Every structure is written in C-alpha cells, then in structure tokens.
Amino acid sequence: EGLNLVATALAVGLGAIGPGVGIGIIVSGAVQAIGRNPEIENRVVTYMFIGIAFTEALAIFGLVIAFLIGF
C-alpha cells in the first residue's frame, strides 16, 4: 500500500537524527580532551569508541527495523 515504505523512511530518518549530534559531540569532546593533554590521549581514545558504538547500535536498530518491515 506504500505506508510500509513510509514506515521504513521514518524509522531510518529517526535512526539518523538519533546519533548524529551524539557522535558529533562525542568526537568533539574527544579531540578537546586530546588538545588538553596528548599523554592520556590513548586512554580517552579507547573510551570514546564504546560511546560511538552504542549510538551506532541504536542507528543500526533503526536501520534494520526498516529492512524487517520491507521483508
């Protein structure tokens, strides 16, 4: 009927707006902390990736919901 397509579109659009500014401020804070001190930069780089991955997982859920709707 085409409303399934609208569902997929809305799902992926929300799943994109979700982590956009999230990962943006993630890497912004990471590079800010790196600028503060390049000694512990490795430790904070290790830590920021899990915060990236959680938002990525949320976006992936939003994306695969659309695929499940399509099939």
Binding site: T46, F49, A53, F54, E56, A57, L63, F67
Partner: protein
C-alpha cells in the same frame, strides 16, 4: 564524465546462496567466508615465510599490524591481554577481509550464471560480512567468551555485577545484564547493517552515473569497513574489561 550507457538496472537482496547444498547445504556466504579464510591463511603462511627475523619482506607489515593490535589491547586491559589476544585478532583481518573483496570486479555480479534469463544464477559471492548468519555467530561467540571470562575471573562478582550491584533498593541488576544481552544482538546487527549497506550503495548509487560516484563512495565504504572491524575488535575487549571491572 557523461555516462552515455552502462546504467542497465538495479537489483539487491538480503543475501545469496551457493551450490554444494546436496552434499551439505552451502550458501554463497559460506563460499565467501571460506575464500576469506584461505586468503588469511595464505597471508599468515607468507608472513611466516622463513620466520628467521627477516625484516620487511611484506611480513613486517603483518607483524606491525599485529603489534599495533596487541599494543591497543594492552592499553585497554592486561588481565587477559595474552589469552584473549588470538580471540580478538580473529575478528581483525577477517572482518576486514569481509569488508575487502566488496570492491572486486563484479563483486555484486560474481556468480551470475546473464541478464537475459537469470534463472538459477544465484550470485556466488554473498560477501561473508554481508550475511546475517556470520555476524550473529561471531557476536554469539563473543558474548559467550565475555561471559565465560567474567565468570572465571570474577563469576561471583559477575553475578554480583548486577544482582549484588545494589541489593538494597534498585541495582544495576536486570539493567546492565539487559544492556549486555542487547550488545551481543547489537554487535551482530552492526556488521549485518554494515557491508550490506555498502554493497547496496555500490549496486544502487552506481546504477545511475557509474563514474566517480562509486569511487568516493567505495573509498568511504572501505574506510567504514576497516573502522567497523577495528571497532568490533576493540569493543569485544572493552566489554570483557568492563565485565572484569
């Protein structure tokens, strides 16, 4: 520049199967995984070569990659930096291998018998990474390994991680455990969403104007695949450390 022709059509699917099913059902994804494993084994054998402390000779590149991975893991944690090192390195250069060969000539067209009929021309490709079974199996193995490590290192504390988290009033109980259970599902889905999306972009975005549109797109896709492999490898160790912590 102009793209006068070449834009025949666009067609994509969840995954592709292969032959050999009669003796043992085999999917095109299993064939791609076997090819990636063979390439990794050949690289290891060539990297091993004489193994007489031979500098450079390509081997040094693999040695440097392994050393970088080991240093990253050691910076992440040290309780299991040795035993879990091969487990973490298993994802590395294999998920990257799944990201690799996605830019091969006719990668989305390998195994097509033929636009005339397309009767049983199931693509003998199905990049392993662009398959839900492989990603789900890898995430399940990672979740099992992390749980086993948490229970063996501090299993009373592994249950005390949530149940004994804050017995009085609320606890991390039922929440952190639910988040960890979702993360294995999240880890499986992240690779499932990845690779397939890239291959989809290569099939669809290059379906119109297959000139310089697929080049930057593939380059971004290659970078994304490498980053995703590294991120999964680091995230497994991070989850293991958080369980240990």
């Amino acid at each position: 520049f102009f793209l006068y022709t070449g834009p025949p059509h666009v067609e994509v699917a969840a995954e592709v199967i292969f032959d050999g099913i009669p003796g043992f059902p085999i999917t095109n994804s299993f064939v791609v995984a076997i090819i990636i494993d063979i390439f990794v084994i050949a690289l290891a054998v060539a990297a091993t070569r004489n193994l007489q402390m031979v500098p450079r000779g390509l081997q040094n590149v693999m040695e440097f990659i392994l050393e970088s991975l080991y240093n990253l893991f050691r910076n992440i944690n040290a309780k299991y930096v040795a035993t879990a090192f091969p487990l973490v390195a298993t994802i590395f250069l294999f998920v990257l291998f799944g990201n690799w060969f996605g830019l091969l000539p006719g990668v989305g067209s390998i195994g097509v018998c033929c636009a005339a009929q397309g009767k049983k021309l199931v693509p003998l490709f199905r990049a392993p990474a662009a398959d839900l079974n492989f990603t789900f199996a890898i995430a399940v193995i990672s979740f099992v390994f992390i749980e086993y490590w948490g229970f063996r290192a501090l299993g009373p504390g592994y249950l005390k991680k949530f149940f004994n988290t804050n017995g009085i009033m609320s606890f991390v109980g039922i929440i952190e455990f639910i988040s960890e259970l979702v993360k294995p599902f999240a880890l499986a889905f992240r690779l499932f969403g990845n690779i397939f999306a890239g291959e989809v972009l290569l099939v669809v975005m290059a379906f119109l104007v297959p000139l310089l549109l697929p080049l930057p797109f593939y380059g971004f896709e290659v970078f994304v695949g490498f980053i995703q492999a590294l991120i999964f490898a680091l995230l497994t160790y991070a989850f293991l450390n958080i369980a240990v912590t």
